[PDB]
């Protein structure tokens, strides 16, 4: 049993909590949650209204596949978003209880070591259940850093070796914690790695809609649309629960290979992962809806707009290509003292760039970096760009 | 491989009946009645709906996968009320799920780590869970036949060879489809065993509140404590489902040994079954309340106590342990030649039993019963059973 729950390793928060631990913040002092990596906003009208109207539903087991209208509501989406990809209802689309169960039970279906044993290769600094989901299904964890300028996967960095057993490969766009988008140069070069090796792409797209002024994320599936690819062996993951602040709800969808989603609804059937209607019926509210997301976006938004030239006082920082996290540069590379000090002298916490991030050959590529998530208020997120510049200046 | 083995798997055996009535249509202006369906069509009650809408703003949390204290501690709460004063430790002896299918379902994964091929038992005929989850999980199962008068199971039938490869053993109870509870004799067997063997002891018992003039099910948790035996190596399974009419609402809990609760706690934050705060709230609504499950019973009691007497007219029947399903011996042994006749005479929807189990060195314990679900409305159910009767006069 234990065997490869042995092989986990502590979470990034719980390696935060025990480098803090004997360093006193100052008395009195109200702690700033900048290391957490989930939003702050609050819950649209639209969605708890819908949720509210259909509980009588509650009362039926309700299908692995789900609804119609709900898989005809992602697939809806998908048009307006990625400016006319089509994308069938009826075979392309899964609703899933919040992508991380479902980033976890497909790698569980994907590795099946008997024997060679599989890898799969994360990008580095990493999303923790890339690993975990990895350990777990009897695979091997394989790491492609993502070095500055453009945080960009290096590919070159896995031999041929790993690359001829490597099952699957995961891409996080926009990344947790850089915010690079992965562009059209970027997927061009992995989907010719899939032509030579044959591995699935499982694209981590749950910050889509968290971007600046227009400048919207390139997808997966649109990429290969753009390249006239087809989608054999791509699936995208995505969530409500960046999107639309319905962390709670655990709701998104899986799209993609039409092949693999079959096999993966059987699956599923039997993992236990079917949506409760009256959640299905808040998701279609939801992905019906863009006024709550534009809204969501103008807050986010402002934040940076203000704390982006706080922080060039003193920091060599840019406003990121999306999501909500600065992936600060720390002057002197020490993260750790970084974290410290932050702590000791403001009570502000920042999560040290190591912790999303193995050891490689080539470094480890969290080193010198810490993680800042705007999550909180404008006022706050200002007050503590101006106290971390004011420690450093 | 996984792929075929999924294509092979049939999760819904009220499905197969279609097949089985390929060509013979019941007749005109006739209602189908659905008896063939082990899931309840009783309304969902406002005590739990009203909690969950109350709560609505907690959406833009995500909940940590342990569960809130105070759902726990409800959990707690019930048990020691339903199991005669039995003390369960909610901080380290409970965990929430999302309906006991993921539940039971995840748990046989973290079991089965396979030269030696490891060993399920259930019982047969069985649960879907119960057969899918061993398999995909790369197990082996095994089958202990319940045959009439108890429908206990029969343990000897399984040879020491595979008791020393055995890993997990399940019980359901009261069980789907012959309405049994395993009894303190039985209980005290399969312990026996477990001492003998060292096998984890899994107990499905989310029929636990569907049963008839005060008799009480009792519960593996109880038997334990009862025969004056630890929770070593024990663990329950139950649900909201059936018990407050919420199958949608995807909540039960896991209860039992400590320290493979640890372990399974650990795996589940990776394969991401934490629970909506609204719905853990919901859930604390519904275990605190007895009223509703009262009413729920009720309905259950008067359709049974119309229903046997009328079927004892023609069949060797008598009301079950509990559950709502008779268990309905067939007189000239063939009950798909049984189920052909009433959907073809009466549009009456039966299960052939042979769907629920499979064969082994001692016949197709299914073979010769159907199941019937009384789920239907009172009038519905004593129509069909006059019907049936007069069919078989
Ligand atoms: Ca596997």
Redesign the interface.
């Known amino acids: 049993?234990?065997?490869?729950?042995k092989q986990?390793k502590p979470?990034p928060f719980a390696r935060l909590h025990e480098a803090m631990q004997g360093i006193s913040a100052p008395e009195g002092m109200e702690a700033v949650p900048l290391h957490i990596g989930?939003?702050?906003?609050?819950?649209p009208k639209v969605?708890?209204d819908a949720?509210?109207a259909s509980?009588?539903?509650?009362?039926?087991?309700?299908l692995t596949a789900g609804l119609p209208e709900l898989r005809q509501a992602c697939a809806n989406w998908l048009k307006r978003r990625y400016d006319g990809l089509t994308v069938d209802a009826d075979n392309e689309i899964l609703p899933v209880?919040?992508s991380?169960?479902?980033?976890?039970?497909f790698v569980?279906?994907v590795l099946?070591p008997v024997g060679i044993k599989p890898a799969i290769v994360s990008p580095n600094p990493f999303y923790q259940?890339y690993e975990?989901?990895t350990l777990?299904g009897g695979g091997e964890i394989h790491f492609a850093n993502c070095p500055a300028p453009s945080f960009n996967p290096d590919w070159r960095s896995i031999s041929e070796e790993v690359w001829k057993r490597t099952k699957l490969v995961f891409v996080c766009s926009p990344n947790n914690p850089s915010g690079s988008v992965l562009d059209l140069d970027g997927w061009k070069e992995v989907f010719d790695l899939q032509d030579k090796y044959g591995f699935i792409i499982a694209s981590d797209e749950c910050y889509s809609e968290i971007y600046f002024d227009g400048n919207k994320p390139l997808g997966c599936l649109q990429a290969a649309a753009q390249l006239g690819r087809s989608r054999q062996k791509l699936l995208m993951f995505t969530s409500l629960?960046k999107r639309s602040?319905?962390?709670?709800?655990?709701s998104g969808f899986v799209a993609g290979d039409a092949e693999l989603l079959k096999?993966f609804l059987?699956?599923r059937?039997?993992?236990?992962?079917?949506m409760?209607?009256?959640?299905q019926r808040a998701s279609i509210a939801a992905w019906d809806d863009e006024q709550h997301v534009i809204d969501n976006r103008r807050l986010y938004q402002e934040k940076f707009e203000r704390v982006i030239p706080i922080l060039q006082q003193v920091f060599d920082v840019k406003l990121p290509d999306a999501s909500f996290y600065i992936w600060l540069k720390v002057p002197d590379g020490d993260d750790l003292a970084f974290a410290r000090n932050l702590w000791q002298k403001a009570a502000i916490q920042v999560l040290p760039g190591r912790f999303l991030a193995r050891d490689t050959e080539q470094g480890n590529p969290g080193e010198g970096y810490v993680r800042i998530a705007l999550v909180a208020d404008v006022a706050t997120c200002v007050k503590a760009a101006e106290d971390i510049v004011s420690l450093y200046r």
């Open positions: 049993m234990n065997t490869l729950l986990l979470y989930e939003p702050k906003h609050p819950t969605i708890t949720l509210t509980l009588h539903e509650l009362e039926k087991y309700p209880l919040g991380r169960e479902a980033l976890f039970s569980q279906t099946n259940i975990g989901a777990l629960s602040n319905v962390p709670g709800l655990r096999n059987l699956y059937t039997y993992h236990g992962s079917a409760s209607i009256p959640v």
